[PDB]
Design a binder for this molecule. Sequence first.
Ligand SMILES: COc1ccc([C@]2(C)CCSC(N)=N2)cc1
Ligand code: NA
Ligand code: NA
Length: 371
Amino acid sequence: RGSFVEMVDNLRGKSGQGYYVEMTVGSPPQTLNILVDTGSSNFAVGAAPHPFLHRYYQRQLSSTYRDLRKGVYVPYTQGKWEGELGTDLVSIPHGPNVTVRANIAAITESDKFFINGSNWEGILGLAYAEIARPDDSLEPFFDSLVKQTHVPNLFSLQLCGSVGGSMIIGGIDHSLYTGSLWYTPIRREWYYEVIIVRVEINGQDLKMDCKEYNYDKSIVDSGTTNLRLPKKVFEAAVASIKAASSTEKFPDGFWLGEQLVCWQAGTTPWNIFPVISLYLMGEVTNQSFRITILPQQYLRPVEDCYKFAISQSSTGTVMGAVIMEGFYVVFDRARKRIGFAVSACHVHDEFRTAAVEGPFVTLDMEDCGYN
Ligand SMILES: COc1ccc([C@]2(C)CCSC(N)=N2)cc1
Ligand code: NA
Ligand code: NA
C-alpha cells in the first residue's frame, strides 16, 4: 500500500499511438508490448507474422496454452480483427509478482489495427466484462487477476505526455500526485462511465443542459488520444475557445483536426489559450469537483508545431490521454469510483498548472445522466 517503486515508469509510448506495458505470456514466458486500454475489455495479441509486428504470440511454444475452440470477430469504426480464443499464463514483469491464467484472443487476421512503425503487439482491455467480445462471459484480464491473487481490486495510471508513465496494479503510489485525490462514481460497470455536470472554458459556463455533456455516455479511456466531445458540446466549446483566442487566427479546418499549425521554439503563446474545466459528479449528494486542464494538454506536439487535440464524437464524451496526462487517475473498482489528482509529472509552466479542486455544490446532477 502507498509505495510501489518496481512499477514506477513501467509504461512507454509514441505520442498519439498510446501507452504500452511489457507483458509475458505462456511457458516459457514470451515477452510482448501491450497497449493499455481502459476503453475495452479483451486481452488480445497478434499471433501471426504480420509484417508491421516486432514480435507475436507463438502458441505452439507454450506448454501451458489451452484452446477454447472458439473464434471471435471484432470490428471498430475503422479497424477490425479476428482471433482464436484460449487461456495461458500471464505476467507483468514490472508489476506484481504473480502469474495468472487469463483469456487471450490470438489475433490471426486484422485490418487497420496494428500500426506500421509502432512498438506494441497487443492490447489489454482494462474495462468490464459487459463490453467483452464475443460476450460478457469471457472473463477480462483484471477480473481473472483479482479472482486468482491477493492483488487488490484497483489500478492507477500516470500518463506523462517519446512518452512514458506508470501503471500501478493493485494500489496507489502517493509520490505520483500532489494535493488530494477526488472521486467520481463509476455510473455503470461496463466502460469506465462517469457523469460530467458542468463545463467551463476559461471560467465561463457553456450554459448547456448538462445532459448534453453525457450524450450518450462519458468515459475515461486510455486507448483514445483526444478529448472527445459530443457534437453539440464540441460546437459550443470550439466556439468558446475560438472566441477566447481570436487575438490571433488559424485556418478553420485546424479546429476540425484537418491540419496543423506552428510557432518558433522557446516561446509559444500559451496564455492566449483558455483553460478547460470539467465538473464531475462527486461522492456526496449535490457535491461536485472540477478538473482543469491547460493548453499544454489539448495542444499536442507533432514532429514547435501542434495539433488540436479536441475533436467531435458520436459515442459520447471520451476523456482520452489529453485529459489523463494532466492527472494521476485511480480506477478504484472495489468502491466503483475513479479518483483524480494533479499529476507530479504533468507538463505545465510558470503561470498556470492543471488542477483538481472541490467541493462545489451542484444540484440535479442525476439529470445529466442519459438513459
Ligand atoms: C491504437 O489502436 C487501438 C486503440 C484502441 C482501440 C479500442 C479497442 C477501440 C478504439 S477506442 C479504444 N479505447 N479501444 C483499438 C485500437
Ligand atoms: Na482476490
Ligand atoms: Na502525493
